[PDB]
Amino acid sequence: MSYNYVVTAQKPTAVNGCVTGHFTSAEDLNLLIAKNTRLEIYVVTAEGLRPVKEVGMYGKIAVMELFRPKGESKDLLFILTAKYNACILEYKQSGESIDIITRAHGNVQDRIGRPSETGIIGIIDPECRMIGLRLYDGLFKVIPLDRDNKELKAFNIRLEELHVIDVKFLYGCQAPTICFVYQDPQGRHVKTYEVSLREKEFNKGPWKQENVEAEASMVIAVPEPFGGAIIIGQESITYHNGDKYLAIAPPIIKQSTIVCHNRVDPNGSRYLLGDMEGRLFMLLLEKEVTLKDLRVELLGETSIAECLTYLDNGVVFVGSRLGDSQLVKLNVNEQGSYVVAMETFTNLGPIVDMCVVDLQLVTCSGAFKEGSLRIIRNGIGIHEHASIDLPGIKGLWPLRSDPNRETDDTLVLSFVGQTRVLMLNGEEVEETELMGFVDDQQTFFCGNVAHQQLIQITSASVRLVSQEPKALVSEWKEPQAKNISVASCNSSQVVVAVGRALYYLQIHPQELRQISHTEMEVACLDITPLGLSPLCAIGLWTDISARILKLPSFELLHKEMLGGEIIPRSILMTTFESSHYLLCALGDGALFYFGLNIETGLLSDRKKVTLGTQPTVLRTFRSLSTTNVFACSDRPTVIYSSNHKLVFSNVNLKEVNYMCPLNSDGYPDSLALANNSTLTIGTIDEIQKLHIRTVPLYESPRKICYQEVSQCFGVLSSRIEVQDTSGTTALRPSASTQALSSSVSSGEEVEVHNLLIIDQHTFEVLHAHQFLQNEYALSLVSCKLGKDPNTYFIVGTAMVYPEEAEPKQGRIVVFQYSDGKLQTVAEKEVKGAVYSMVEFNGKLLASINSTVRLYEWTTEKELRTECNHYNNIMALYLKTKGDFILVGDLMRSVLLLAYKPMEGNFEEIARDFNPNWMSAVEILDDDNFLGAENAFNLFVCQKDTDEERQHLQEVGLFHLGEFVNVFCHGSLVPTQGSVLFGTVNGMIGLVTSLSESWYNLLLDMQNRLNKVIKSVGKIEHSFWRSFHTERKTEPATGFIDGDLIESFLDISRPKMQEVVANLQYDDGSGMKREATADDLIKVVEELTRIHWSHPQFEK
Amino acid sequence: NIINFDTSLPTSHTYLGADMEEFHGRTLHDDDSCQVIPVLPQVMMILIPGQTLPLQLFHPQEVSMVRNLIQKDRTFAVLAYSNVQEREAQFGTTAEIYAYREEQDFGIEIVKVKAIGRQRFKVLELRTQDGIQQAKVQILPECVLPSTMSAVQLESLNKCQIFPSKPSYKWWQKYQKRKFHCANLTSWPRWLYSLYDAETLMDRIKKQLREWDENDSLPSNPIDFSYRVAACLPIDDVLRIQLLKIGSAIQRLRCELDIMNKCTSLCCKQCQETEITTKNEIFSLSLCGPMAAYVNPHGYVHETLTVYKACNLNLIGRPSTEHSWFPGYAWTVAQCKICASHIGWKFTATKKDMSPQKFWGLTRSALLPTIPDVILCL
Ligand SMILES: Nc1cccc2c1CN([C@H]1CCC(=O)NC1=O)C2=O
């Protein structure tokens, strides 16, 4: 709406930089990784990496370099942001307190200047005299690294060469000397300049080389003893110094464009090189002291590397933007030099499309061989340790068969009319017999009871068994030999139900004595003592109510009617944080949780939750010193309590029918889980985290739609193929060439487009349909149309030819996925590109070139044009709400149309032209529209006299710092609405609406928090969030930074009071009063619950 | 082929007479700033930035206004009239005087000026004073965009963004593949980004400018190129006011390319359906392009499009070289044979060795660009 709250659900995962050095101490080897707005600091260890500190910056990191000035005990870090915020940082540690301190800072943007074609380059000379920055054409900015230069004051030196490709400071020179590749009308060349420190000007460099390779792009400064520079191009690698010149053009690099490098050893004898496709090379400088030759070796394949950094022990960090980052080992005489992957680090970026399943996020992630689906869900994972093939389990119980051990050593399992016993000795499970227990009756309960005894309650009877001599000592049966229907038991009490009748027995040495009997249907029972329980929870069939009876009197203390026809399945009395509760699960998956008094026995407050569609089974288990409840159903849930309030977390597992805690020698503080075919032994994760499943496709996913009725996803993908000599061939197997079934519509690279059908449970590629040659699949929908009950996958295409700029042909193809195959139901030829499509009130709305067209789906199964709106812009973006349609182009031209049912046509309602690159757009509500625009901004426009009605008003501007590819309405977990976004860096965010009152409070709170939060590099939050382009800056408006608001929870108590001191809190009446720290704490904690939490980086 | 005709002659406006005093100072007003600028009362033309406008002023209030203007910033406002009769305009362009000459022979004061379009503006209000109007205007910024890839560009590929110089169909295929490689990080393909790429759009336009002018000398900045092209397109006032409203060079180029591709027929505006000439007959007799503004002896400005051949016109009067905008040619009034509307003139060479021996100069205000069997497209 007009007031929006934006918050990060998943921090950026793509790596844009990586450096090593001695930052945390002189003795540590660190690995520093830049992930856009975040800096990760690791200590390199023999095992791998130890995370020590992660920080966020109010900026996009564009330069990240470690350096050591004279006099400094350890390295300092230089950072330059995309908004030209420069800083020098120092790591400070005292015990467990870690602070990143700003030694120096300043903004180095020039009032005028043309940002260079090859971007921002920041370099530091070997002697640490200066930072050299190439920000603009014709200028070289020098920041002297003098102790007193705390404002990073700089001077510019004119560069006659206006088209510089790359630049480095050389080693082994008497004065700071730059070496650069540049292009001019006479070709591509290499040159050097000395920096006169006294004059603050360039002097002639020691050497130059005109007419280097046409594609020379990378400069590498070689250290002493040799010095000089290595220049890498498309087909050649050259070495240059004052007189020396070496050149190689090996066949091993013919198919490569080398775009990243890293030095392996301090003397520069070896360099790692990465191309655009995952090949990793070692460049070796051969000596005879003197430098005699260059040699390249292909090491193998890594993720497509944005950046590389050698660590130690033959281990290399591969920072990836297009796929997962990695740790690889260069093993690398008997064999050639080669690399092996050791570790993988999740990267969701680029997120090019995404969809939500249920009410999980599924993204189209990566590109090329790194292309994948990522299935994301929040929840509590289970580390599985063991699996046993034992079908039909109807119940699970832990047991300690040894009275001199506190740990469980037995798992008792029930089956229909049967009971089995498993003994545990370490991780060795062996089925045995239990003397005293019957194996021919289904067990309803069994376990350790008072007086060193065991109990087994079956349909037939209640059996008491001694521990030392395993034998039956006392048995209870119904007076007329009737079967027990429901059973409940604790250490000293047994409450059994025989249809409508109820019987209360007590456990004594070698005896089970029947105390009470009352006729009530009985559906469920419970006697958990909150060790003799004075109360008894019960569930009934006729009234469908949960009642709390007394013991041993059986007098009704409370009767809570649930209503409906579903009978209750499970009842439980449990305590969370000293507060007593009574949970009750129904036969439809509903959980009615009520407060309970151990003395009075009444329902304090009643609330209802939905924990699945299958009936829920409740089981107590202990985590830490607290008590939790495991809810078994189709969606297993762990019920717990935070601040005396119940929290229901998802378990990261499919259907769990039964569970029991298990604390054995081999499986301490574990659990046993059972589904219809398997018994699993596992350990629950301490806390909630995002669980991500990766589905590699080895080709580019582009668009995704979920088809619930078919239990699958439709994915548009493309793979690159090359012109083969024996005429195209694929470069590797991928999802579109490895599908279970396939269909077709009928050395340069070609793109082959496909529609993949992917199973939602196994993620198998069930089908791949290949589009026509030169056909580009652009848009995808899954929907029902008209009166046809079938759900279809619909694809919009363009025919693409290099000789034609504008698409003149394309089609809309309607597919049906039935049985295991994709059938083409219908197609419609259009005379242009089908950029977008949306299902619109049972019709198909499509944007073709500059037109918006509405199609009706007829009983003859054909698309028939109803109406067509000619726009003066390309209808690139298409979003709808009701009868309203939002149209957008790449240049941020926004158009609002309304379909008129009585006219069978569109009417233009409003429009706005404000030229800028626009990457995505979304409808927030009937009057507000959200977009993403250059550079890394969000905007909101609103519809407000004909001229006034047709005018979209700018109501929101915010510099997000990420590039949005997709917006989608969705719930993953004051505020109103939920719009999720996926970005190039793999960051996922949420936009939600606020009332004006909440916006005013949070805006005021931001201003106050900005005075207390320490900013890394001393960048102002307002400057960071200001709407930004290269030419202009405007303060943010109509957006609250949720990430900043949440940081309020991590500041000291005095600082919280300082932040809220002049805040006016409104508790819903307009009568504003001074806000307290406790008021804002609960408001901000509530705000944190609207999105997935962020994992702690360090141990 | 143009033989024995100096194509540099039309832009010099030699018909205005002896050498004029030149002014080299440049006044530019801040973006979005509000300014009060005088309007010349009889000026009716829609000025494009960078476009020359010759004027001849005979009224003492126009003469004193221009004399005072020369002393100051030398800038006046040219309104793009929506309704010329009611004198209402929502947009316009400033014009900066760069050449001036005053004639006082026989006691008759005349001021001749050459001005150039500078900045676009929105009319906030129009107030009439000495008879000269003063427009309160808001300066409209020129929207300069980076490359579409500049935000999404992977830093490892920044070093590959300078390509070897253009020598070719294969060069442009390689240009698209390399410049838009990071399209694979976004929702769209490289061929879509090419449709919004300044260099690509300017190259596509240059192919059609070669068809008009066989004998490059064109701006490298897309802003200047888009304005140079805008001033050449023979489009009606409704289309031109829409083109003047565009603030981006990319949208301006896209729009010009779309008109050039669609509007291949030029009809009589009054008639609507009478064809006068086609896109195939357009040529550049002036180095500025196929169409330029010229001023007649009474001070009226005509944007005159030069075509090799025109049809359905009747010739009234006898050829005259008096005040001819094309030295060496005589003009004769040409009227539409159907409605008698004055469309322009037939120009005939006064010397046998000249080429072309004849051409037509058609006035922009009399033509209607037609798509043979017009939605402005941004
Ligand atoms: N003599 C006269 C009277 C009224 C209007 C006009 C003229 C001459 N003229 C044009 C004729 C074409 C040319 O090359 N130069 C001109 O100046 C007019 O537009």
Ligand code: NA
């Ligand atoms: Na300019």
Ligand SMILES: [Zn+2]
């Ligand atoms: Zn006519």
